[PDB]
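Observation: inputs received (chain + magnesium ion).
Thought: call the complex predictor directly.
Action: predict_structure
Action Input:
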Amino acid sequence: KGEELFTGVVPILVELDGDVNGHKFSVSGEGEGDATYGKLTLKFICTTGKLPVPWPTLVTTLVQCFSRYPDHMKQHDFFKSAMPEGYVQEATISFKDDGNYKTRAEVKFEGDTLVNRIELKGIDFKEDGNILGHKLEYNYNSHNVYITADKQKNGIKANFKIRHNIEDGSVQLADHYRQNTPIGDGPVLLPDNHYLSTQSALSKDPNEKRDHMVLLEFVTAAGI
Ligand SMILES: [Mg+2]
Ligand SMILES: [Mg+2]
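Observation:
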């Protein structure tokens, strides 16, 4: 049972290689998750210099196995069930009136550590749009991630809309379409329709000179 791997505090590593409109960059993250409380705490560093996109646009790419699934919903937790072999998470993020990100990640244990390894590719972004023009506020709204099964692929799909606040009071929509597929051959849990209720707080480390993001996140399964 992968769920048994999450009863306590688990170290997390995140590594992302990105290319947006030919701007190349990498991000490294470290922290821990405590699924019992649906809680994530991570610090992300742009190891290549200045991040060429706003940090908030990377939040959904940068480990939903740390969601809190209520006891009565535990037979719907696909993410922990795929562990430790892990799962592939792929997404298309469409920024309304702008470019798109396509991502591919593997989330699995490396020893006792939960690792999220990501490749991100962004194209067709506007030079002085909200993303490349860095016009997005350093904050983050609360969302519901709607999950449905894809029995065909032995996995799940997610559909949701991220709303990014813009510095002028407007909103930049990011439509998300994602698929998750197990890496191993063992049985996984295919859930009834439900959603993950997420809340995210972004901050800075006062002693840190590199381009970075400190994130505190709470995720709870619901709708069943
Ligand atoms: Mg490193
Ligand atoms: Mg505002």
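Thought: report the result.
Final Answer: Residues 1-224 form a domain with the Green Fluorescent Protein fold (CATH 2.40.155.10). The chain has one domain: 1-224.
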